[PDB]
Fold this protein.
Amino acid sequence: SAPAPPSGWSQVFLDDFDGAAGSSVNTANWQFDTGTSYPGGAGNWGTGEVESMTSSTSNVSLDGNGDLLITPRRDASGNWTSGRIETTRTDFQPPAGGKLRVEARLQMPNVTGDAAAGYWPAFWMLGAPFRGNYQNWPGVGELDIMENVQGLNKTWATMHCGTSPGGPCNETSGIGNSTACPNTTCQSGFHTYTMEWDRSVSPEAIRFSVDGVTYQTVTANQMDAATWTNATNHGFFVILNVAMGGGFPGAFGGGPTGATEPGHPMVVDYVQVTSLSP
Ligand SMILES: [Mg+2]
């Protein structure tokens, strides 16, 4: 369960994924992305990933112990399925002068080596104008709070913005970094992945951390005013998924292969949004 926030912070959103084992997610908080694209969006979720997303509890369910499970599955015909859920809410944005923290505590799919090839878990945010549009990436803004591939002991955090390819945000790489999980591997158990959006200073800043340790900071002056405005002057929605294959795993050896093992969930204790007043 989420621990109490620090002094002065208020709760904006919390889903701690409590409920019986094998039961369905709270759809007051979450909506399902299904198939191989948004309705009228880019093919294969824009990444070349090979799974079809579903709303089945074979791919998205609770563990009964306070966690969401998103589990890639491979059927007897060789078809991959997985889960991709987004917050119903799109409003997350601190007021000017304020701060926001968006956080998840999760275990990355516990699989390494050849068996992990293609596994692409993610916990991320997309600018509200993307919803029902699907055609305004990267200008609309993307905050990747945790990404991982290949069961490697590291987390990537990235901001996407501006134009692609290139532009001030160096697309499609984005403004990002990777680091090992502190103390224990990312795959071994829970870690906390946090984005702090700080509108209390000039230049405005976004800081990504793992287990309370900051590894990537992005500041507004890294791009022009219009680019920052387009990327951040709106709410965001939150997304949790495990992609299978596509470009990110492709840059780290590829996958899935015949050796990739299905059935290793991303285990998410909670997603929480908190706010600090100006
Ligand atoms: Mg929980």
User: Anything to note?
Assistant: Residues 1, 16-18, 66-67, 269-270 surround magnesium ion (CB under 6 Å). The CA atoms of residues 25 and 61 lie 6 Å apart. The first helix runs from residue 225 to 232. The two ends are 28 Å apart (CA to CA).
